[PDB]
Amino acid sequence: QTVVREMENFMERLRQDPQGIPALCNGALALGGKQGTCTAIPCNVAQDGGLACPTAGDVRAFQVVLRVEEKRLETVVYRPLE
């Protein structure tokens, strides 16, 4: 499936650009010829690595949900310590 492959490529593109995610993953877009959407939820990361999405405080990672028709792909992109 072309759509699944494109969703993975785009997701990898986001994973390389965590500081760009608020702009690059911000509503509707086309992938593999179909309309879909990207949503990025800011998450906290505990000292033990536990994830809180959405965050009540610091944004240390994003929960990214890419949706194209019924297909869906969710991952976590961690932000650099800086």
Numbering used by the authors: 44 to 125
Passage from the reporting paper:
Type IV pili (T4P)1 are long, surface-exposed filaments which extend from the surfaces of bacterial cells. T4P are composed of both major and minor pilin components, although major pilins comprise the majority of the pilin subunits within each fibre. We identified a cluster of type IV pilin-like genes within the T. thermophilus HB8 genome, using the program PilFind. Three of the remaining six, TTHA1218, TTHA1219 and TTHA1222, yielded crystals of truncated forms which enabled us to solve their structures (designated here as Tt121836-123, Tt121933-236 and Tt122238-123).
